[PDB]
From Swiss-Prot:
The encoding gene: dsbA
Every Thioredoxin domain range: 4-184
SS bonds (residue pairs): 37-40
Any one GO biological process: cellular response to antibiotic
Family the UniProt entry places it in: Belongs to the thioredoxin family. DsbA subfamily.
Pfam families: DSBA
PANTHER family documented for this protein: THIOL:DISULFIDE INTERCHANGE PROTEIN DSBA (PTHR35891:SF2)
GO CC annotations on file: outer membrane-bounded periplasmic space
Descriptive protein name: Thiol:disulfide interchange protein DsbA
Keywords noted in UniProt: Disulfide bond, Periplasm, Redox-active center, Signal
Domain of life: Bacteria
Function per UniProt: Involved in disulfide-bond formation. Acts by transferring its disulfide bond to other proteins.
GO MF annotations in UniProt: protein disulfide isomerase activity; protein-disulfide reductase activity
Keyword presence, Acetylation: no
């Protein structure tokens, strides 16, 4: 796709105060999501393989949407699992537990007992979940979402500058095409 396909402010929004990227020198791509959001679950098998194919000049990051209440609890679980280094199938187990099994996963005790049956070490989970370090990460993730001015999920942000989502892009594949377009826009601008 190209500029002809989009209207700035519609399919994507440009931030007036670009947010510094996590990895200088690479084009950042962030997905913000909540485990409990049905469209986040539906988007997972679309965004994940795409992210695996990203080139060396792109740096892909995921953040929990810490939008309050159970979103924060689930987000803390996400940060915990990421820190532990789990494989992606564990994330699918969490999604499935919430969306298909209707499990609440509302406390670390419940999470650890559930995840223990999904190949996640309970003691490492509880230690990580309850760590001072994870509190720091949570505060940073809250501040980032505020800086990105995110209102919903799943949301994409390219290079700390352009925010878009599935609705704004017009569908799951459209979201990836828009991401590719904005990534290329940033890539080209840096080559001038």
């Amino acid at each position: 796709s190209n500029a002809d396909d989009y209207t700035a402010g519609k399919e994507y929004v440009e931030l007036s105060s670009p947010v510094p990227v996590s990895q200088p020198g690479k084009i950042e791509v962030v997905e913000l999501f909540w485990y409990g959001c049905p469209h986040c679950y539906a988007f997972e098998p679309t965004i994940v393989p795409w992210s695996e194919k990203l080139p060396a000049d792109v740096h892909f990051v995921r953040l929990p949407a810490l939008f309050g209440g159970i979103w924060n609890v689930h987000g803390q679980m996400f940060l915990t699992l990421e820190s532990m280094g789990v494989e992606h199938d564990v994330h699918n187990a969490v999604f499935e537990a919430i969306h298909k099994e209707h499990k609440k996963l509302a406390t670390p005790e419940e999470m650890a007992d559930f995840l223990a049956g999904k190949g996640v070490d309970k003691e490492k989970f509880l230690s990580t979940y309850n760590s001072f370090a994870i509190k720091g990460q949570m505060e940073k993730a809250k501040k980032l979402a505020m800086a990105y001015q995110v209102t919903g999920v799943p949301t994409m942000v390219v290079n700390g500058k352009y925010r878009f989502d599935i609705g704004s892009a017009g569908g799951p594949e459209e979201t990836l095409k828009l991401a590719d377009y904005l990534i290329e826009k940033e890539r080209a601008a840096a080559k001038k």
